[PDB]
Amino acid sequence: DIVAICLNVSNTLNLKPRTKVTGAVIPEFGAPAVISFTTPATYLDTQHIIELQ
């Protein structure tokens, strides 16, 4: 299976450029998935969807 966890971060975390984001999805049992990315140096208006990790 593949499934997408959807999070709206607009007011909660302030993801401007050059910003490190760290985290995990932790299940009831078993090993966590590790989220780890740094947002790009430049965001362009021609490319509103970005691949982060």
> Is 40 exposed, middle or buried, given 0-12, 13-18 or 19+ CB atoms closer than 10 A?
middle
Counting residues that bind other proteins (by CB under 8 A) gives: 6
Stretch of 1-9, 20-28, 30-38, 42-50 contacting other proteins, by CB under 8 A: 42-50
Query: Is the separation of the CB atoms in 43 and 17 below 8 Å?
Result: yes
9 contact partners, CB below 8 Å, separation of at least 6: 15
Stretch in the footprint of other proteins (CB under 8 A) among 3-11, 19-27, 29-37, 44-52: 44-52
Question: Is 43 a binder of other proteins (CB under 8 A)?
Answer: yes
Q: Please report, as ranges, the residues that interact with other proteins according to CB under 8 A.
A: 41-46
